[PDB]
Amino acid sequence: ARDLICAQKFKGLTVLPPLLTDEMIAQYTSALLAGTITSGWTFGAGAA
Amino acid sequence: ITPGTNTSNQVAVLYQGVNCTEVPVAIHADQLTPTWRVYSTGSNVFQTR
Ligand SMILES: *[C@@H]1O[C@H](CO)[C@@H](O)[C@H](O)[C@H]1NC(C)=O
Ligand SMILES: *[C@@H]1O[C@H](CO)[C@@H](O)[C@H](O)[C@H]1NC(C)=O
Known part of the structure; x- marks a missing residue:
């Protein structure tokens, strides 16, 4: 078995996790979503 | 993870995609670069994703 990602991990083929x-x-x-619901579009041009 | 040569010479090393337990720095097996070795307990070893 050993899955497929683990098999690709060998032979120097890794995956870098996302920063976010x-x-x-x-x-x-x-x-x-909260900004859009409460402040509408105002929060996109300054303070909510 | 060096913060810049100008700021300081202290550096941090990130080993990519390896569990710290089975591959620590203090093992005498000399996992490549025998002279290149971080201190065993210079700072706490942090395991990240
Ligand atoms: C580090 O950078 C600052 C910012 O310009 C500079 O003033 C300082 O001289 C630099 N350090 C050295 C040792 O030159
Ligand atoms: C590292 O190995 C130890 C012992 O086998 C285990 O308890 C721990 O969960 C492992 N960490 C990761 C991130 O796999």
Whole structure:
């Protein structure tokens, strides 16, 4: 077995994890959604 | 992870995609570059994703 990604890990073929985690991307999306819902488009041109 | 030669000569080393437990720095097996070795407990070893 040994999966497929582990097999590719050998022979010097690795994967670099993303700098921004999925949780941080979700937090960005939630902040954008909250800004759009509460402040409309005002927060995109200054303070909310 | 050097913060710049001008600022300081202290550096940090990031080993990519390896668990710290089975491959630490203090092992006498000399995992390549025998003279190039970080101190065993210079700073706490942090395991990141
Ligand atoms: C480091 O950079 C600062 C910023 O320009 C500079 O003033 C300083 O002289 C530099 N350090 C050395 C040792 O030259
Ligand atoms: C590293 O190995 C130790 C002992 O086998 C284990 O407890 C730990 O979960 C491992 N860490 C990772 C990130 O795989």
